[PDB]
Design an enzyme around this catalytic site. Sequence first.
Site, PDB file in Angstrom:
ATOM      1  N   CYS A   8       0.829  -1.196   0.000  1.00 57.51           N
ATOM      2  CA  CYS A   8       0.000   0.000   0.000  1.00 57.51           C
ATOM      3  C   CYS A   8       0.872   1.257   0.000  1.00 57.51           C
ATOM      4  CB  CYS A   8      -0.990   0.003   1.175  1.00 57.51           C
ATOM      5  SG  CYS A   8      -2.018   1.488   1.287  1.00 57.51           S
TER       6      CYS A   8
ATOM      7  N   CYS B 123       0.142   4.480  -2.124  1.00 58.70           N
ATOM      8  CA  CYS B 123      -1.167   4.305  -2.747  1.00 58.70           C
ATOM      9  C   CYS B 123      -2.230   5.163  -2.059  1.00 58.70           C
ATOM     10  CB  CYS B 123      -1.572   2.827  -2.713  1.00 58.70           C
ATOM     11  SG  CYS B 123      -3.162   2.468  -3.497  1.00 58.70           S
TER      12      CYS B 123
END
Length: 121
Positions: free
Chosen positions: A36, A39
């Site tokens: 992640c 992101c």
Amino acid sequence: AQADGIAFRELSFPEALKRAEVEDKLLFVDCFTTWCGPCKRLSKVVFKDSLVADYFNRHFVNLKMDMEKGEGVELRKKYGVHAYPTLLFINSSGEVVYRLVGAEDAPELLKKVKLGVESEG
């Protein structure tokens, strides 16, 4: 206040190409790592701007592509992942015009998109 932005759809490889062709043209393949990290940063700032979102959502067909499931291993190995966020600009024919390795700030990102699809010299 409530405002959102770019939202990638999730469908299989065959469905992706077919949908790109039928909906308009071009596939914007958002390849992310399970990490992640950045992101959600992009999700914070970029996913609030209507113009940047509109340009992407309208001029391309959006797709969030897995990298851990759903045959992700092939695209991972074949398209040469190096970090966490990777953006693939691919035609409906299934050929990429540019592989964006990494993520930069919104204006720079939008810039990299254009330079990747339409490279000036």
